[PDB]
Amino acid sequence: YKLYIMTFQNAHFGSGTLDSSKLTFSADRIFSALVLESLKMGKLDAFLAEANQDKFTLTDAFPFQFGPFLPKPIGYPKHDQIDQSVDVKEVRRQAKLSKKLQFLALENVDDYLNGELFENEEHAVIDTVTKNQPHKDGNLYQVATTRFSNDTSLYVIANESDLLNELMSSLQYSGLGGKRSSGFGRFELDIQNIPLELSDRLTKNHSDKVMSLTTALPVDADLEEAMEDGHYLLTKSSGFAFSHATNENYRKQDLYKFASGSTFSKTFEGQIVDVRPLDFPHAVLNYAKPLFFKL
RNA sequence: ACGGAAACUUUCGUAACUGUUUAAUUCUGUUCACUUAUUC
Ligand SMILES: Nc1ncnc2c1ncn2[C@@H]1O[C@H](COP(=O)(O)OP(=O)(O)OP(=O)(O)O)[C@@H](O)[C@H]1O
């Protein structure tokens, strides 16, 4: 499998509320875009039977600035791995920056566990604008933008085949998150040849102090042993559904999954949960497959 | 089958009303058109 490289600028990626926005984005945001364009193109009965093929998976948002970036491990270092806090004045001034850290570089994935505390590089500044609506007198909303600079890209790793190359190629001329009606979500698809020789520790078999990402959800069956002696971080993601027959826009059920970079100790399974409020002619399904890293 | 769908910071209104580039001011102070000469 290969990987896709794309960048964003002057876009919008909300989180929780329409007026609020963040830098990265969840993993289920990409999967919800390929299904919408499959019915419009003419292959709805072909993309549904491809995502549930086990070997086909997706990733979350990862920055790309002169090298790939990886999230920090949750829980590391522990109380014994970290150095002894002899002087509390010199430890509290550097331990707070590790909690607010976003992502780590590709050359610091092996030295962070031995003792390395530094400030993360600033990706982009948060910019916001304002609009209104004349001929109404009674509407004033606030929206934000994600204007990236200093060469900031958000690559994605998927399973390259003879059908995926024709699906995500037309996505750059559309939108992905934020105000799509204005033109927030366009990117530039860039393909290469030989992937990175360093980030090749992705497997789904053994479980020897691994770490699952992509903000996946564990299976409903095995959970007592997988969650035991582990860590996670609950998030928040909800919203209305996409349909054309219903005239009420029902609110979908929330799916408080985990976060990226959560360490565990047992191989998960990764199933497909069905979320249906009342009734819909289509089918709302969740993806987010876990990906383990050897660390 | 996307915290996404739906949206003009819009209409508004001479940078304007009075004001001599002028007040003071001899293109003139000195200056033979001439030295020499029988209309017989
Ligand atoms: N009066 C108090 N008694 C006990 N604990 C306190 C009191 N005031 C604050 N704290 C503790 O201090 C913590 C907040 O620390 P704070 O964020 O102010 O550190 P900081 O000033 O940012 O550190 P630095 O200056 O190194 O950045 C809280 O978790 C709280 O438990």
Residue numbers in the entry: 3 to 297
Please quote the authors directly.
It should be mentioned that the D33 residues in Csm3 subunits of the target ssRNA-bound state were mutated (D33A) to eliminate ssRNA cleavage. The cryo-EM micrographs and 2D class averages of both complexes display clearly a worm-like shape with mixed particle sizes. These heterogeneous particle images were classified computationally into two particle populations each yielding three-dimensional (3-D) reconstructions for the apo state (big [3.4 Å], and small [3.3 Å]) and for the target ssRNA-bound state (big [3.4 Å], and small [3.5 Å]). In total, the big maps contain 7 repeating Csm3 and 5 repeating Csm2 subunits, while the small maps contain 5 copies of Csm3 and 3 copies of Csm2. The target ssRNA is slightly less resolved but still well enough for us to trace the backbone connectivity of the core region with an apparent base-pairing to the crRNA. The heteroduplex of crRNA and target ssRNA show a repeating base pairing pattern along the spiral configurations of Csm3 and Csm2 subunits. The pattern consists of 5 base pairs, followed by a base pair disrupted by the thumb of a Csm3 or Csm4 protein. Therefore, the Csm3 or Csm4 thumb intercalates within the crRNA-ssRNA duplex at 6-nucleotide intervals. Our structure clearly shows that the DNase active site in Cas10 is located on the opposite side from the last modeled 3’-base of the ssRNA. Although the model of the 3’ flanking sequence of the ssRNA cannot be built due to its high flexibility, lowering the threshold reveals a possible locality of the 3’ flanking sequence in the map of the target ssRNA-bound state, which does not occur in the map of the apo state. Since these bases are far away from the DNase active site, the influence of the ssRNA binding to the Csm complex must be accomplished through an allosteric mechanism.
In a CRISPR-Cas system, Cas proteins form a complex with a small CRISPR RNA (crRNA) to detect and cleave invading nucleic acid (DNA or RNA) that has a complementary sequence to the crRNA. The Csm complex, with the RNA cleavage site located in Csm3 subunits, targets and cleaves ssRNA at 6-nucleotide intervals. In this study, we determined the cryo-EM structures of the Csm complex from Streptococcus thermophilus, with or without target ssRNA, at 3.3–3.5 Å. The results showed that the Csm complex displays a spiral-like architecture, with two spirally stacked density columns, including a single Cas10, a single Csm4, and multiple copies of Csm2 and Csm3.
